[PDB]
């Protein structure tokens, strides 16, 4: 299931997994609540091939600033530690699947 990442372990997490989907979210954002369960299904479907991580922008402002994430929810896919895809806003699960499978062997 989705793990939590912070400004402290953000880099360490990205360097240990070949493919990581990071959800930049906030508890005061309705759209974020909507994709939460969707990201959970994504976590299961791609277990072993994808790590789903969640970055709470209110608790990790420097990480959000780092990537200039001004609108949430925003999901960024990292491959070998580098960003490769971005999905802005609450969206159907198929949109995430498409960008994930685009980078899977």
Indicate which technique resolved this structure: X-ray
Largest pairwise CA distance in the chain = 37
In the chain, where the domains are located: 1-105
Could you tell me the two tokens for 100?
Answer: 């994930």
- Please state, in angstroms and rounded to a whole number, the distance separating the CA atoms of residues 59 and 56: 6
Dist CA 20 CA 13 (whole Å): 8
Active site residues: 29, 32
* CATH fold label, 1-105: Glutaredoxin (3.40.30)
Determine how β-strand 51-56 pairs with β-strand 82-88: unpaired
The dihedrals phi and psi of 25, each to the nearest 5 degrees, come to -140, 175
Q: Which two tokens stand for residue 70?
A: 């001004």
- Resolution of the experimentally solved model in angstroms: 2.0
Map the chain to HEC letters.
Answer: CCEECCCCCHHHHHHHCCEEEEEEECCCCHHHHHHHHHHHHHHHHCCCCCEEEEEECCCCHHHHHHHCCCCCCEEEEEECCEEEEEEECCCCHHHHHHHHHCCCC
CA-closest candidate to residue 85, choices 38, 34, 21, 37: 21
Specify whether the CB–CB gap between 66 and 83 falls below 8 A.
Answer: no
């Amino acid at each position: 299931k989705p793990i939590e990442v912070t400004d402290q372990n953000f880099d360490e997490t990205l360097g240990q997994h070949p493919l990581v989907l990071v959800d930049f979210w906030a508890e005061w954002c309705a759209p974020c609540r909507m994709i939460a369960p969707i990201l959970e299904e994504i976590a299961k479907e791609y277990e072993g091939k994808l790590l789903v991580a969640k970055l709470d922008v209110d608790e990790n402002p420097k990480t959000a600033m780092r990537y200039r994430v001004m609108s949430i929810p925003t999901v960024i896919l990292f491959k070998d530690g580098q960003p490769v895809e971005v999905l802005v806003g609450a969206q159907p699960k198929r949109n995430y699947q498409a960008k994930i499978e685009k980078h899977l062997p």
